[PDB]
Design an enzyme around this catalytic site. Structure first.
Site, mmCIF file in Angstrom:
data_model
loop_
_atom_site.group_PDB
_atom_site.id
_atom_site.type_symbol
_atom_site.label_atom_id
_atom_site.label_comp_id
_atom_site.label_asym_id
_atom_site.label_seq_id
_atom_site.Cartn_x
_atom_site.Cartn_y
_atom_site.Cartn_z
ATOM 1 N N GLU A 1 2.622 4.858 -4.169
ATOM 2 C CA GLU A 1 2.446 5.491 -5.682
ATOM 3 C C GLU A 1 3.814 6.003 -6.087
ATOM 4 O O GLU A 1 3.882 5.894 -7.412
ATOM 5 C CB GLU A 1 1.566 6.836 -5.504
ATOM 6 C CG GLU A 1 0.207 6.630 -5.246
ATOM 7 C CD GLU A 1 -0.303 5.534 -4.178
ATOM 8 O OE1 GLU A 1 0.203 5.795 -3.115
ATOM 9 O OE2 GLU A 1 -1.070 4.351 -4.464
ATOM 10 N N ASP B 1 0.820 -1.341 0.181
ATOM 11 C CA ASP B 1 0.034 -0.005 0.129
ATOM 12 C C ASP B 1 0.970 1.500 0.063
ATOM 13 O O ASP B 1 2.290 1.120 0.275
ATOM 14 C CB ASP B 1 -0.939 -0.172 1.408
ATOM 15 C CG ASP B 1 -1.949 1.103 1.411
ATOM 16 O OD1 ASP B 1 -2.555 1.499 0.331
ATOM 17 O OD2 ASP B 1 -2.322 1.562 2.207
ATOM 18 N N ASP C 1 -9.290 3.748 -1.861
ATOM 19 C CA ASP C 1 -10.463 4.261 -0.848
ATOM 20 C C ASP C 1 -11.507 4.721 -1.750
ATOM 21 O O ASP C 1 -11.785 5.862 -1.478
ATOM 22 C CB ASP C 1 -9.616 5.173 -0.031
ATOM 23 C CG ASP C 1 -8.146 4.785 0.387
ATOM 24 O OD1 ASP C 1 -8.111 3.417 0.643
ATOM 25 O OD2 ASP C 1 -7.475 5.619 1.003
#
Lengths: 691, 173
Positions: free
Chosen positions: A321, A318, A414
């Site tokens: 990016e 997670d 999300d």
């Protein structure tokens, strides 16, 4: 400087002297006669920028670009390719977490792909700046891109997959029902929940452990009070036949006595001036591993391998990016007590501009290779499994770049629970799917908890989420910390039963889904597909987004509204209503007749749990266990001996019986219109005939 | 929004008197429309068509008025009705709204669903001004880009409007 190479329907156009984020081998790199003009492209080299132009006709369709919160046909928008923590993203928000610089053009029914191998902030202006043009801007003085000939969309994806990498083949349990939360703890509560779920009839494949399991959010650690005995938890889950997937972020805490920080020293990201890039993430002050380097990857694989050796079954990557919060926190420190509202600029969560990496021994700016960061982290993590000799690999990633399919599943981040989100998620997963990333899904029930008013936590919506994702490769329920408990066992009997039946139905179809997964790992064909994938010649199909194909045979039109019935658009050809047996002629609009609108097109073979089989029309299909099944001229042939429990044949012409291997006649029973069932329960040597 | 008006120090010359913009602001479009209308007369053009966004009492002498940059949504259907009827009952007969909504995709609260688009065509069935308009980044809303199912619905609605056109134009007279 312009060079063009051709190799099996793929044109590699090299502008200047490119330094790709990653290098893709090109089988037999041979010079080409093909000119930019014959390719219908115009190229311009300017101030450290390359602009590539293509014309755009009124009826031309543009698809791809991966994870985009927009309609599947991308026209009339300027897209930005830059991985970013999108926060509580809404529709039409751009960019998002994943960047696949690939788009496919379908003109006159013919598909052609365009893949720009740059992990920089690539801009795809699709008929926005110039109504009749697709203008691609790469913020680099050089670049390499590929023109991938079709003519079928599937042809483009096969070639594209061949080029960037075939999807890995995950274990069957990876497609099972996953429960997750941010977070489940302490360890005894995890087991208690799994027990209640199983006791009430929910087949749970695995449990995801979010950041609360760590000690002060430190990677590769167990919270001393919430997770005292991790091996006890692991054995308890395994004896219950449940897998354990642990989240692993990318931030290494700048801590004097934190092992990973000390052993990773020398392999972290730096800034232009030479110091380490020190930022902010969950652990607090943090540094980040420079995954572009081989030694960093080897170091990370070692940690992953050691973490896996405890019995952890999967890795959930997670915030890769990569995301950093130092800039945002800086703004809050300075303008803290000011009664003003800050503009929510998501780009502020990316790495700052002075960060550098060492790619193939060369020092490069973060902004030039940013999007490939998650690709390399996933690569290193995958290597971690190899190091552990773990054949069953499961890796989930939030961000990605072309090639990410080699190593991980991707979920849409999300999301916010709401009726509109049902449609949004469909666009997101199909966008990824049509862009080379087959194993995708969204958080069932929505991630956002209750930190803002526009969150719909109603139970009937939750059920529709379970129903929506019925055939998605990744099937996981996940919720934010302050969200209500969304596990089915906490639902009133009425809703609990609905979720239970939906999950059972997914497991009934799991053999088919997994067979498609095998197909994906071998040919690069996506599992779930937008209708235009199978019917690219029909313009109508590019406007249908609340429906999707599951493989080549199954059409699913999930109910995404409060209504009890919906309108279903059927492509050309004949379709079989799974629930009532009605057969309908394609290229029409009909009303759904069940809560889960499922249709099988004429020419389908579907494997079901318990060795069940459904055959409708003629076609050829390869089951996940390598057994090939063929239906043709009233004959069902098997490449090898396989057991068959129940056989269901859908046929307009009546069936009185079937013959097994030319010597055993078995009675057939007509259960409803066009539906015939035969209880076989035995090994079939090689064929079944329909009489 | 008031920041987009002319600043307070702007002046005009109305009938030989130097006036502040804030005293005569609303009539600006009236006079622009007047001059434009005069443009048609100068061209000896008898078939006159002028569309204006703003207006003031008397604007009906020279132009049609559409409701501006509306946002496509189910609620907008009701809003547009109030807007065009408000204008209509106030002396401005030739009015309409952007069929399908103007806003494209620059913010989340925009509904570009096809059944809504059809309802826009249906809503404006008898509006004097019948125009489809869309922002640059909006999806293509022309009926020819719609799936057959929705394309036919729009087609029939438009044909129905033309069937009633003689009545509508008689009311225009």
């Amino acid at each position: 400087i312009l060079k063009i190479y051709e190799n099996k329907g793929v044109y590699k156009v090299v502008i200047g002297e490119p330094f790709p984020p990653i290098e893709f081998p090109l089988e037999q790199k041979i010079s080409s006669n093909k000119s930019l003009s014959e390719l219908g492209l115009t190229i311009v080299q300017q101030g450290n920028k390359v602009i590539v132009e293509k014309s755009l006709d009124l009826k031309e369709h543009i698809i791809g670009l991966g994870e985009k919160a927009f309609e599947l046909d991308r026209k009339r928008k300027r897209y930005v390719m830059y991985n970013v923590d999108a926060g509580a993203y809404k529709k039409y928000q751009d960019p998002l977490y994943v960047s696949i610089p690939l788009f496919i053009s379908v003109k006159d029914g013919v598909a052609t792909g365009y893949f720009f191998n740059s992990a920089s902030k690539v801009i795809f202006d699709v008929g926005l700046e110039e109504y009749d043009k697709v203008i691609v801007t790469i913020p680099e003085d050089s670049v390499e891109f590929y023109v991938i000939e079709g003519p079928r969309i599937e042809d483009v994806l096969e070639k594209y997959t061949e080029l960037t990498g075939k999807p890995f083949l995950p274990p069957m349990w990876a497609f099972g029902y996953m429960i997750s939360r941010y977070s489940y703890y302490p360890q005894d509560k995890v087991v208690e929940l799994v027990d209640i779920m199983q006791k009430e009839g929910f087949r749970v494949a695995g449990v995801f452990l979010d950041i609360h399991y760590m000690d002060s959010y430190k990677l590769f650690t167990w919270h001393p009070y919430r997770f005292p005995e991790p091996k006890k938890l692991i054995d308890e889950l395994h004896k219950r036949n449940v897998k354990l997937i642990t989240i692993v972020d990318h931030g290494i805490r700048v801590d004097q006595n934190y092992s990973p920080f000390l052993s990773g020293m020398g392999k972290f990201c730096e800034i232009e001036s030479g110091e380490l890039f020190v930022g902010k993430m969950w652990p607090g002050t943090t540094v980040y591993p420079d995954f572009f380097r081989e030694d960093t990857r080897e170091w990370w694989a070692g940690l992953i391998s050691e973490w896996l050796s405890q019995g952890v079954d999967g890795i959930w990557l997670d915030m890769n990016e990569p995301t950093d919060f130092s800039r945002a926190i800086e703004i809050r420190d300075v303008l803290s007590s000011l009664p003003v509202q800050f503009r929510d600029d998501r780009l502020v969560t990316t790495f700052p501009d002075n960060v550098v990496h060492y790619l193939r021994g060369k020092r490069v700016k973060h902004e030039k290779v940013r999007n490939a960061y998650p690709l390399y982290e996933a690569m290193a993590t995958f290597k971690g499994f190899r190091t552990s000799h773990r054949n069953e690999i499961f890796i989930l990633s939030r961000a990605g770049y072309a090639g990410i399919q080699r190593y991980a599943f991707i979920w849409t981040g999300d999301n916010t629970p709401s009726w509109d989100d049902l449609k949004l998620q469909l666009q997101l997963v199909l966008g990824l799917s049509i862009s080379g990333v087959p194993f995708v899904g969204c958080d069932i029930g929505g991630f956002q908890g209750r930190n803002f008013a526009e969150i719909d936590n109603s139970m009937d919506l939750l059920v529709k989420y379970y129903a929506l994702a019925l055939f998605f490769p990744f099937y996981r329920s996940h919720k934010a910390t302050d969200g209500i408990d969304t596990e089915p066992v906490f639902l009133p009997d009425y809703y609990k039963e609905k979720v239970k039946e939906i999950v059972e139905l997914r497991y009934k179809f799991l053999p088919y889904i997994y067979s498609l997964a095998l197909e994906a790992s071998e040919k690069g064909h996506p599992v779930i597909r937008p209708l235009f994938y199978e019917f690219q010649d029909d313009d109508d199909m590019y406007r249908i987004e609340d429906e999707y194909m599951v493989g080549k045979y199954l059409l699913y039109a999930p109910i995404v509204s409060k209504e009890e019935s919906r309108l279903v658009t059927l492509p050309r050809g004949k379709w079989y209503n799974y629930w009532n047996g009605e057969i309908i002629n394609g290229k029409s609009v009909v009303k759904s007749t069940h809560e889960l609108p499922i249709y099988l097109r004429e020419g389908s073979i579907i494997p079901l749990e318990g060795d069940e089989l459904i055959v409708y029309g003629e076609t050829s299909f390869k089951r996940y266990d390598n057994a090939e099944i063929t239906s043709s001229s009233n004959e069902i042939k098997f490449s090898r001996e396989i057991y068959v429990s129940k056989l269901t044949i859908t046929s307009e012409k009546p069936v009185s019986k079937i013959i097994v291997d030319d010597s055993k006649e078995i009675q057939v029973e007509k259960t409803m219109q066009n539906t015939y069932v035969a209880k076989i329960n035995q090994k079939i040597r090689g064929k079944i005939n329909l009489e």
